[PDB]
Every structure is written in structure tokens, then in C-alpha cells.
RNA sequence: GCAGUCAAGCGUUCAUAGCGACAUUGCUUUUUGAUUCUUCGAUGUCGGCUCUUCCUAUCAUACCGAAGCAGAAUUCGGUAAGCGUUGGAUUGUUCACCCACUAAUAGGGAACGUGAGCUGGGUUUAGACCGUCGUGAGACAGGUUAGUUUUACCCUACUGAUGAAUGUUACCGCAAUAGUAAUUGAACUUAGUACGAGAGGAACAGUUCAUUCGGAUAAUUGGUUUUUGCGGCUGUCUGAUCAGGCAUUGCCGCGAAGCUACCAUCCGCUGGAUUAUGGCUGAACGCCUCUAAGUCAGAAUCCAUGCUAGAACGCGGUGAUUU
RNA sequence: CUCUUAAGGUAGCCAAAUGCCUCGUCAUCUAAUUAGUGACGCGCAUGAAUGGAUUAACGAGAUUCCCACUGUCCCUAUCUA
RNA sequence: GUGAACAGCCUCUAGUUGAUAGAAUAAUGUAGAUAAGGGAAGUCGGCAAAAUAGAUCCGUAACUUCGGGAUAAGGAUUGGC
């Protein structure tokens, strides 16, 4: 009855459900729109989320009072081994949406992404893709047939990928298995791409550089059933209440005769799958360098692995990125990269990064030293030694 | 970038790791972390704590080197 | 209005009811909080100064012909830590303002401590008589 | 209460920029009344708190038009309810009045929303005091103080969580439909420019920041501590010593991990159609006319893009299918 | 000076637990007070054992302010049974 | 035993170890706690909670029925050997 005192809506409707999701691994619900006049290239990644940490960097800001100046920033690192593709897959337009006609594989699929297909491997034939590994026996009439009906048909093309698992040190020995989709010319160039780079593998270098803005696709972490307070950041209510206290005190009037939709109730919190956008790529490192974590100013030889590896995930012996700021998703959780879905010109993601240094002490605590050696000359001999 | 260091033991404090406090006056102390932050305000010598270097120097503890 | 520039986020501590150190020698000892100037709105919330912030403010201890009466004053210290862009944590022991009149121009002739850059570069007849800084 | 009409007059001249007497037609039902149809084998009967949604007769933000509009500031009016619309002193208060910040501090509804949601200050039981009245009992929208606020395990609704039936099982997808969130200001510069006699005094673009809202994260900073992790301290018991027990976690400092904070950090999209309105060509009317045909631009609006779920009876693709 | 009736509120006291008009008026406390305190008192309707005024001390009485204090609150969070 | 003390806390004697249990450690709860900056802005209203708290020394106002007020306020010390 006009509310003594207008305020705002606690919370974010279009979000909703806030249910938990079908998978950990978030659909892409869009690619970037496909320019033809280009090589065949991923529009996106796979990763999994190693961990946090802080960097040292120049701003080139111009009018900041921080111009020429350094800041501390916060980057998450996600560890991302070269992906393996296994297959391609045909979509045609309807006015029902775009449909997949068919789907084909390569020959020798490996034992993580034949894991995936099952769900107990340890007693199992294995028998998933003999038939079909028969197939290729021949010339590959039939393969080419269906790589040909592709080349008619198949408005799109989306490459089926899968992730080197057994590389990061997770105890996951089933891949993740994904959908990306090509953005580039000649769909006959694609699939011709794509079977040579059947059973072959596809790295990080050649899809992304520095600078670039990046949206991230995650499943939130999970916190199970959740209060109403912390779930939609409702006011507490006071200390004298009867019943509770962690609670909508008014759920709704009398007419309508309902409760609606959009009052805050209790249910789950975390665990949905979120798209964040415009995280800027700031290093793309390898693991066969073992001055990951080096620097042009930091010329000490360090890998990005703290001291006592990163927490809950372990050491990094493979590829990485390092992106701005905070990513959705805890530690070891696969996180989908894709590039951006528009042209940014905000000089923000104009701004040519150079770093200056990376934070590599122990984040298990609160770490002084960034290297064993450091730690060793600074302390001298302990007890123990020689 | 510079490392500073604890004003309470002299230890390392690179960019973030580590609080700061100005003094009513101007005198500023850096603090790696709460631990010597804290022992700050209780008033204390590092000259009794065991393991700060103002102490471990004072009592000459693991140098070697400056007869080197 | 009145001031140099911009400023940056920076974290609160002095809301209203606060009461924060005259700094100056223009002849209070307090300086009463009623309202900061920026203070945009929200149920129940209360306007949090900060470093730096002009205010709207009283005095409590201070001449007769000082206190009870409303003025401008602009904040210089406080013991809410914060952080800048250099990722550095700081704060000062305590909270302490000063006076002046909109346009900022102070009605002390100095000052008596330790000061902020974000209120120095963002005052600046204030950063004239400005002794040491931070 | 609110909106219209005619125009006598104001408006220096000028009814109609803005107003508007005498009169007059209407709207609403958030005022208060009139009624007494419902409920007296009972609907919990002030106000506050919290929370959502809705309305426009729009306070501000957007695009506009008009002005006795030079500029600035202001006023009148249109589209618009997309987003917002505070903090405190006194009072039980609604209301009312003050202080102050603000872009603004617009008004109203939903059983005068909301008591198995809270409170119980007020009213409105029993106790007690005064005043006035009454011979007296006792009374007085006259004052004052103290005065038990119950039940959900059910149905639906909502929130989130399972799941049968489709040949089985596994993997990848489509996306019907439903929802949607971005907001507002300041500083610099434009520019002491334009404008103006001066007085004073803009705007567009651009740059840097901020507010409110929202979504994630925990590197760092802070907090939290049953890591009962280390140390210390009291009483007492184990003869001592070491080592340890009990003190409803014995207490204190540190206290990582984990969780968490505008008390920390990061992030918050672009295309079309449109309204008002201004115009194009141009008829009707041999002229005129943005309009009738037809047409260009054009808003914080709509639909899309993007975003969340994925129909459990919507679907596709693919692998495997038992001595 | 009178009528009136038996006499006409004396000392004292107050918007007070008594005052309608009432947020009474002045001052003071406040940034701001329908609150409080002190003062005015033609006081609807104060008042002398139907006890008046004042009053140290005491009050699980009612009320205001101040210092300290504090998660009551801005603004919520973490932990144990 | 500690300690002013039959207080609280631990123990000897004697009696008990019995009050449906098990696994988890979600929300909401009851009881309990701690929390940066601020300090009653909340609220009818400081309800609740916090703070102070023992002993010794020091000093201890107004007003007063001269007895008190008063632990006033208000500062300093406490261990072990």
C-alpha cells in the first residue's frame, strides 16, 4: 500500500533459475559471429583453473594520475594442454534452428575420450568405436561420402576437441570432450583442416595473443542450499524477532493470492553456469619454458608454479594462461575461453600490457620468498644441511 | 618495484604482501602480515624476539660472511 | 565541488555520528559528522565519508563562537585502511579533518600532521599549508 | 482531490507565453461522509520494520515542443512508469515540522497489502494517581504509569532437489517457450568560449573517476577459529621430573586452510523497428500543407543480439549394443 | 463599589502524573526536538490532613542528558554444541 | 587445596556413569561466542550485549535531617625468585 519508503530489487532476475546446473562443463550458448574471409581458426578454448595470484604492471593510461605507473593487479592462471581433435560436426539451417546432420571421427580416438563414453571403464569391453575404427579400413569411401554431404550441406562446422587431462596433475582420467565452432573461410577449407589435424593436436599459441578481451565460461562454485539472506543479500532482519531472523519477514500480500515468482526464497547458491566477459589476456606461456614466471625485469629463471605449487591443484608442467582478475569457478574446474563476440575500443582493452613481475611465494600461507634459493641465502644453514 | 621490509623484524615485503601504518607524527612502519603488525601494537622488542633478524644480529646469529 | 580532480574509490570508515580529530589551528578540537557531500542514496544506508571527502560537519569541543553551528569541513587522515592502485595497504592511527569553506579554502592558516595524497592533490590550498604527507 | 471548457480581466500594449473572475461539463475513489448488502457458533481490529508487484495524474534521468527563452537559471506542455526517489532530531504516531546530503529526495494501490512474518510504543480488560462531574457507586476521543501476541508435519503457491514410461545405455547438440539489468552524477577539456552592454555565463564530442544495482572471485588486505596447529598463563590431580587430564571449547597472543566483505578485488554487450517531434516529396483545395497515399531521421521505450533455464509427453546427431 | 449566596482560592505551586486551545509563550540544551529542564501563569478544571510546598537518604518505579562501552545499527560475516 | 569464604573450580571417601541410539555437518533455529572503521546514527526507548568488577595505596564534590552521600568520582600496584 505504497510503500513507505521506495528502494531497489534485491537481486538479479534474469539469472533465473538459479538452479543447479546440468553439467560442469558450461554450453557455449554463442559463438562470434563467423567472418568467411579469413583462415580457419577456434573461436574458443578449454582450461582448467590452476589457481590466483598478483602481478606488477606499467598502466599507459593517459589523464590517470597513475600514468607511467605501476599497479598491483590480481590474474587467475588457467592451465591448458594442447587439445586433441577427435572429430567435426555438421549443422544445417532450419526454421527450426540450426540441426546436426552427422558427426565424424577420427580413427584412433585415444583411451581418455573412449573413458568419457563410459561410465564403469576398469570392468568393460572397450568396445565403443571398433566398428567404427573399421570404417577406416578401407579408403574411407563412406568418410569421404559423409565429409563430402558436410561440404554440400552443413551451413556451420564445429570441431569436436578434447582435453589432455592426463597432463595436469588432476587423478581425472577421463577427458573433457567439447563442441567449438570454426570462424573461418571455405567450409570445404574446414573439414579439409580439420582431417588433417584429425588425432593431431591444436595449442593456445595460435589462437590467442596478448591483449586480447576474452569472455570466461564457468560453473560457479557450488555451496549447496542456501539461505535467502546470502542467496539474494536481503536485509537481516532484527534481533527481537520471533522465528527467525535469516528471513523475508513480508513473503507477500494477500492479493494476489500467491506467492510470486520474483520474492526472494531459499535454495540453491553456487554451482550455476555463468559467462563473464572482457578479461584481458595478459601472458600465454608454456610449459617447456622453465621461465614461465620470468619476466623481462624479472630475468631470475621461475616458472609461474609457487613455492609448494599452487593450492589444490598442484605444479604446472604445461602450457598456461594467465588472464585478469577473477574468473567464475574454483580450482579444477574446466572452464571454457571464448574470444570475444564484439569489437572493443574502450583503451582498455586498447592498453598494451608489459609485466614487471609476478608473485611466485607460497600461497598456502603467507609467503616471504619467492624462490628456494632466496629462502636459503636469506636464512642460511638450518639444523639440517649438508 | 621496490621490496621493502618488516619495520618490526626486517623482513621482505614485496608489492601488496604486507600491510602499512603511519604513525601520528610521520613515522611509518611497513608489516609483512598481522603477526608483526600486531606484536607492533603490544609494544614489543625485536630485540627479544628470538627469531627477528634485530635480534639474531644483535646476537650475531648465522652471519659467517663478514670475514670473508 | 570545489577540488582538483577525481578520486578513486577508497574504503570507509567515518560514517555519520563519527567524530574525527580538527587537524588545524583554527580553533576546534572535534569535528562532528552529519553528512558527506557526494552521498548518493539507499533505505537505511548512512552516508560514509572517506579520505579525502568533503563533508558537511559540527563541532563539539572548540571556541564558543565555533561550535553549534554547521560547516564544511574535508577529511585528511583515517584509521580505516584502504588500498591504492599499488596494491599497497595503509592507514593512519586516527581520523582527523579540517575546515574550510566549499570552494576549498581552508579557515585555519595550517595544520598539525601527517596527510594523504588523494586530499593533496585534490585540494590544493590545503596541500600548500600541507606539512608532511603521508 | 484532479482534469476540461467560455473569456471578463491581469499580463506595461497583448484574453489565451503564463494566468484567469462570473459560470459550466466531467474523472477518480488513496480523504471524509451517506448506506448497512456480507461477517457477531468471530476474517486478528493503529503504526513501524522487512519484501515484491502494479498504476500515472512523471519529482528526477532520456528525446522533444513552447515561452514575455539573449546566455544562464526558470516556467508550460508531449511521449514515456525503463531506472531511481535517502539520511537523522521530536512525536506511538500515519500525518506534520526541522537539519543535511541529493539528479530527485513525486504521489498512490494491492482485505485503508503485509501479527501461524516481527514488534506491542499507542489504543482497548483487570491494578494505581490527578483534574472535572456526580450525594455515591461510578463516569470523562481528558491526562498518566504497569500490563502472557499461540499452532503449520497438511493442500495449493513458491523456492530449490529426485524420478518411472517410451528399444537399453553413453556422449555431443538444437532451442520452442519463459525471464532480463543496467543505472546516475561529478571533474578536466571544449571554454571564461559562444551569448550578452556588462553582469555573468553554456552545450556537443573526447578523457578520467565516482554513485546505486547486479554477477562472480579470494591473489593480496581485514575478519572468523574445534587445525584444538604452536606458544604462554591460573587453579587443581597424576609423589617429583618430563609429559599430561579437568575448568559444559579453561583463558590469552599468533594462528594457516576453508568461508567471507564495497572492510578486498574483477566484470557489466550491440543491431533493428518505434513513440513524441522535426522533416521529404506532395494531393485533396489549379496555391498552401510532414499526410491522405507514400517516405527520412528519431527516446532511458519495444524486439532482437548477448545473457539464465532447457519443454521432465519438443527434437536432432553419434558410439555401443551380452553364451 | 456592589449583588450573589455560607464565604469567594489565602499562603504556596504548574502546560506539572492535574492545562482543553497545546507542538501554550520566553530561554536553554540540538545541526535540527510535538521530548526534557528552568521561567510566565485569569489556572477549561492547582491548592492546604478530600493535606499544600519542599525535602537528605532509598527506589528491580516513570523520564531526559552526558562519559565510557558495545555487531542495536551502517553491514553483515565466521565458528562450536 | 585455591581463595575472605560451605562462593566458583579440581580432588580423596561413598555413589553414579542412567536418561533411545547411529551416520552426516544444508538452510532456518535454541544456547553460546568473536569480529576490522564508526560508536546508539538503530530503536518507542540503549531491550539485549559489551564495558567496569577483587585486594592495597592515594584522593574522594555537590547537597545534607550533619548520621551520610561514598566502593563516590576518580588515578597508580598486583606475577615469579
Redo the contacts between chains.
Keep these: 500500500s505504497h510503500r513507505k519508503?521506495?528502494?531497489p530489487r534485491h537481486g538479479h532476475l534474469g539469472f533465473l533459475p538459479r538452479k543447479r546446473a546440468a553439467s560442469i562443463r558450461a554450453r557455449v550458448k554463442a559463438f562470434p559471429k563467423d567472418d568467411r574471409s579469413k583462415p580457419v581458426a577456434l573461436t574458443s578454448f578449454l582450461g582448467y583453473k590452476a589457481g590466483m595470484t598478483?602481478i606488477?604492471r606499467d598502466?599507459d593510461r593517459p589523464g590517470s594520475?597513475?600514468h607511467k605507473?605501476?599497479?598491483?593487479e590480481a590474474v587467475t592462471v588457467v592451465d591448458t594442454p594442447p587439445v586433441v581433435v577427435v572429430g567435426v560436426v555438421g549443422y544445417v539451417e532450419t526454421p527450426r534452428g540450426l540441426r546436426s546432420l552427422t558427426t565424424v571421427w577420427a580413427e584412433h580416438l585415444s583411451d581418455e575420450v573412449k573413458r568419457r563414453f563410459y561410465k564403469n571403464w576398469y570392468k568393460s569391453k572397450k568396445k565403443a568405436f571398433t566398428k567404427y575404427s573399421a570404417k577406416y579400413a578401407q579408403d574411407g569411401a563412406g568418410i569421404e561420402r559423409e565429409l563430402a554431404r558436410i561440404k554440400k550441406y552443413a551451413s556451420v562446422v564445429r570441431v569436436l576437441v578434447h582435453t589432455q587431462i592426463r597432463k595436469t596433475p588432476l587423478a581425472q582420467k577421463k577427458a573433457h570432450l567439447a563442441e567449438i565452432q570454426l570462424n573461418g573461410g571455405s567450409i570445404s577449407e574446414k573439414v579439409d583442416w580439420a582431417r588433417e589435424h584429425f588425432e593431431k593436436t591444436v595449442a593456445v599459441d595460435s589462437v590467442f595473443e596478448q591483449n586480447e578481451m576474452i569472455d570466461a565460461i564457468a560453473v560457479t562454485k557450488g555451496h549447496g542450499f542456501e539461505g535467502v539472506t546470502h542467496r539474494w543479500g536481503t536485509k537481516k532482519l532484527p534481533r527481537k524477532t520471533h522465528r527467525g531472523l535469516r528471513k523475508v519477514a513480508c513473503i507477500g500480500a494477500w492479493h494476489p493470492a500467491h506467492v510470486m515468482w520474483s520474492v526472494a526464497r531459499a535454495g540453491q547458491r553456487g554451482y550455476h553456469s555463468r559467462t563473464s566477459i572482457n578479461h584481458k589476456i595478459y601472458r600465454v606461456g608454456k610449459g617447456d619454458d622453465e621461465a614461465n614466471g620470468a619476466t623481462s625485469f624479472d630475468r631470475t629463471k621461475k616458472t609461474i608454479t609457487p613455492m609448494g605449487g599452487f593450492v589444490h591443484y598442484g605444479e604446472i608442467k604445461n602450457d598456461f594462461i594467465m588472464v585478469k582478475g577473477c574468473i567464475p569457478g574454483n580450482r579444477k574446474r574446466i572452464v571454457t575461453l571464448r574470444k570475444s563476440l564484439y569489437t572493443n575500443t574502450s583503451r582498455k582493452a586498447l592498453e598494451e600490457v608489459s609485466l614487471?613481475?609476478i608473485?611466485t611465494?607460497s600461497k598456502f600461507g603467507?609467503?616471504?620468498?619467492?624462490t628456494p634459493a632466496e629462502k636459503h641465502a636469506?636464512?642460511?644453514?638450518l639444523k639440517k644441511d649438508l | 618495484?621496490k621490496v621493502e621490509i618488516d619495520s618490526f623484524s626486517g623482513?621482505?615485503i614485496?608489492?601488496?604482501?604486507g600491510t602499512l601504518f603511519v604513525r601520528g607524527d610521520s613515522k611509518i612502519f611497513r608489516f609483512?602480515?598481522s603477526?608483526s603488525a600486531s606484536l607492533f601494537k603490544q609494544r614489543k622488542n625485536p630485540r627479544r624476539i628470538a627469531w627477528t633478524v634485530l635480534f639474531r644480529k644483535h646476537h650475531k646469529k648465522?652471519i659467517?660472511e663478514e670475514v670473508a | 565541488n570545489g577540488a582538483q580532480?577525481?578520486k578513486?574509490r577508497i574504503s570507509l570508515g567515518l560514517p555519520v555520528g563519527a567524530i574525527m580529530n580538527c587537524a588545524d589551528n583554527s580553533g576546534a578540537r572535534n569535528l562532528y559528522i552529519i553528512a558527506v557531500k557526494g552521498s548518493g542514496s539507499?533505505?537505511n544506508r548512512l552516508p560514509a565519508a572517506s579520505l579525502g571527502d568533503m563533508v558537511m560537519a559540527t563541532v563539539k569541543k572548540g571556541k564558543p563562537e565555533l561550535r553549534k553551528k554547521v560547516m564544511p569541513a574535508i577529511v585528511v587522515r583515517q584509521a580505516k585502511s584502504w588500498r591504492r592502485?599499488?596494491?599497497?595497504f595503509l592507514y593512519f592511527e586516527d581520523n582527523a579533518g579540517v575546515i574550510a569553506n566549499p570552494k576549498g579554502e581552508m579557515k585555519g592558516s595550517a595544520i598539525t600532521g601527517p596527510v594523504g595524497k588523494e586530499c593533496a592533490?585534490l585540494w590544493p590550498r590545503v596541500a600548500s599549508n600541507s606539512g608532511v604527507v603521508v
Excluded at chain 1, 366 to 370: D, L, N, P, S
Excluded at chain 1, 378 to 381: A, E, K, L
Design positions: 519508503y521506495e528502494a598478483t606488477v598502466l594520475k597513475f605507473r605501476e599497479v598491483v614487471k613481475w608473485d611465494a603467507k609467503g616471504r620468498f619467492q636469506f636464512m642460511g644453514t | 618495484m623482513a621482505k614485496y608489492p601488496g604482501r609483512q602480515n603477526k648465522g659467517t | 580532480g577525481t578513486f539507499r533505505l592502485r599499488d596494491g599497497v592533490d
